[PDB]
Design a binder for this molecule. Sequence first.
Ligand code: CL
Ligand code: CL
Ligand code: ZN
Ligand code: ZN
Length: 1040
Amino acid sequence: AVNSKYHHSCINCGGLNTDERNERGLPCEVCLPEDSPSDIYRALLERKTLKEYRFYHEFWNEYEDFRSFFKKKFGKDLTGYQRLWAKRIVQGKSFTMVAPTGVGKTTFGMMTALWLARKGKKSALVFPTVTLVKQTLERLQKLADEKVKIFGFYSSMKKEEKEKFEKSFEEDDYHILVFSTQFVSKNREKLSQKRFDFVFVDDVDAVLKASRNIDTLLMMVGIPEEIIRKAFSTIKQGKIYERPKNLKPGILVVSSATAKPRGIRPLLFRDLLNFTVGRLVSVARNITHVRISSRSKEKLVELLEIFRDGILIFAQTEEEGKELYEYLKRFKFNVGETWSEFEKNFEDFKVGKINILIGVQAYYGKLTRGVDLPERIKYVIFWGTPSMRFSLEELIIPDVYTYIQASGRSSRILNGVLVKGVSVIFEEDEEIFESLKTRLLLIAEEEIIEEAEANWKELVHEVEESRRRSERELTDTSRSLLIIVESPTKAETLSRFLGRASSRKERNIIVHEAVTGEGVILFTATRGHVYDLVTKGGIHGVEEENGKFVPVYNSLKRCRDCGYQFTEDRDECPVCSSKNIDDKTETLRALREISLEADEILVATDPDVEGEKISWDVTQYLLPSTRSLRRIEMHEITRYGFKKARESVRFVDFNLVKAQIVRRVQDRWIGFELSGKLQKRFGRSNLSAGRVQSTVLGWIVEREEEYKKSEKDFTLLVLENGVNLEVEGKIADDVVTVVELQEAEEEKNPLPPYTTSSALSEISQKLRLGVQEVMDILQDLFEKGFITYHRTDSTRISLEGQNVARTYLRKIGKEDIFMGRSWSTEGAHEAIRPVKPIDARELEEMIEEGLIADLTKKHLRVYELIFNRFLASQSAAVKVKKQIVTVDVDGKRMGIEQIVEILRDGWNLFVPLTVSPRFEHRTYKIKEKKFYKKHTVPLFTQASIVEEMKKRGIGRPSTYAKIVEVLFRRGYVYEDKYKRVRPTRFGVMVYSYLKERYEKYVTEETTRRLEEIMDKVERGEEDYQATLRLLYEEIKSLME
Ligand SMILES: [Cl-]
Ligand SMILES: [Cl-]
Ligand SMILES: [Zn+2]
Ligand SMILES: [Zn+2]
């Protein structure tokens, strides 16, 4: 803990509680003054302070009662998938069973119905087919007690069987009803009046066929007809309906999402029952892609004699497919086709009558996407890369989405086991194949290896053994994992490589669900910070107990209309009086509710000081509710980045948290005191955001005097055969004489990769954009998985990063200039570099063709600079021919150094290296002289302010853009025609007022000295409490 107090963090009364008690799982001392109690529930019951811990205590008892009941009846312990479902059942929440097909899905509904029937609650189990109704009817009767009465109805039973069901239904003397989906449609009026506590639907597709069936299910759990129709009108309008809090509906469980729901009706569950009937897209696949450089029929036969069975061959056209079918029939092969007759040939393939099935590639084709048989489909062979026509000119480009679908027929999570698949591409066109690889990397992050790299014996064994494990009763190892991030953009990027299987509306936040080989994975975004320093009490929100400063935090509130943020517990916005407020208190409560359902929770906030503060705020809040809390940091939002983050899973680093607190307190104490004085003078609030802002504003103000005084005379000299020369003063001689010419050869090393400061400066200058706009683009690229983390002070490039450059250079055929460089060895982050070997031009083509659409032209131009800068650092040095020439102009000697020839191309392929016309040891006539004035000391630019902050040791990678932009927003600094920053008249007076009274507190030496100390606090070298005393002594002096 960091000895901090958080509002609404107590798990028993919802009041203020310290982080030390939250870390130990204890409530606030008002509820329980004891430090080491045996049982928290008994302690609160003893003192009669038990308010909300009762709900938690019942939850764990109910789950164990369900868990023990499951073990007694079924004889097997709850699986990982069923652990998540059981906890949602006892909380009275409707959900879609996000899981692969299996017997555990149907048996869980049977156990829940029996468990609810034991306490007297009625259940209704709905099944698609009559045969499934009978099977579950006899399975329930064997295990249920004689006191539990179960009745079913179908069209195949005798009239005596029907009559006893109808008698019981009207008598309402039943516990579990097992009827078909057709019964719902033909008896929706009678079922609407009856209310059930648990409804289980084995097949959602049957319900989706009839629009009335969806409304009937909602009425079964107690939702009134008026609410359903009004919500549907709101959904059709476009808005999101709000479920009234007085409504307590039953549990509705959808067994399997089948990606079929396309109408607008299924969205009713999202607003009325807080769960989404998902369009299950399972991005989970284990496929080895191998490319054979030739398209010879002889090599196809040799490959088919290794796989020998369960092979699909996808041809580009029907004519080519017929050609392969007859060639594979001349040679003795059990081969079929799917164009003249599909159902018979596929059935023969399924039963083993046919070993090889040939089809024609097509997007959403019946063989490409329609079939689902990973048990039989093991090897997928493409006779030519699947291609599509783009634009009116019918450009032929690879169709990666068809390739993903067709290759996906051989790999999915089957019976809880992700079976292995092999995809083989016969392609001779290198340009088509290389285009396919980049698209597959961008979309699926799957590589395609060459024929020599592949080992067919290993792949066949890997294919056979994986299906062997799916056929047998697997021991359950599945777990439910919760990933907590702060950015919605990161969550959307995660869902693209994890799968947006289903969504749950949990108070403010939306919790997504996905299926992996390890089980379910949940991920949600908190939408920014959760806690912030309070305003009133103590020293500007910081109390002082026992000689130590205890920060006091409250949940952040953001007005959705005007965007104003505040921490006070209010019903309306302080600025516009709007009640539409995004309160992080509801976000925190939702996280606590979800923490009970997940087996383990990982807080994947950004890997910096501010992200660590957010992680500990969430961690300490959820600790009283769960113990499986750990911290991971993703340096790139990709499958690889997620894997690497989990490989180095850790706990919260309190050194980083303390660094954020001292940096926040310094801004709060300096800012509020200075703003208070400035408010009395200039009538504006928040005129001082901190100490660094005033120091930078000082530089811009001082630059006016330095820019004016440095005004010197200059003359531009153009020469007969030569370069333009800048020389001081007025030049009267009409010739320039070379007195010494020195020419030699040199090797030019490239510049290091981008850091935050260097990327901001160079990109802003070249693209004519503000540093804040560039920073936001950098954040967008990182959170969308295109570059590494953009808040870094290091040039370090890992071996993986160097491999990225090598892969691109091999792709373009320029690997002879590859020069892997690690650059720095220190640093908690890599430099800003692309994560995939895809240049900007390739990315723009993908955007134009619709593969991705989340990048604008400014994003591409920023990415281009990052890509070329990084690959320049990973490219060979360029050998040049340079000359050093001494010239005499108006009797005074001047030195000129220039490159005149490039002898060996290197990194200049990515960052051009300009050459100049060669000089000779002779006299040069002057064609024309241009007379002008230039200032020796130039005006500051947004790029050069970041450079100055870096070299003067003030500012951080997380604050460089903010410091510059705040000066603009406060009205202190403006930009002229040439994008040079200058102080406004108001900005001058603000700095003048501060210099006369508070210059010592805002001078650069003080700013740098405090920055160095707070850096050591981050590294654990300076004490956290001692640093706060240093600030407290300083602010006490300036309050006089
Ligand atoms: Cl490394
Ligand atoms: Cl930082
Ligand atoms: Zn309490
Ligand atoms: Zn507002």
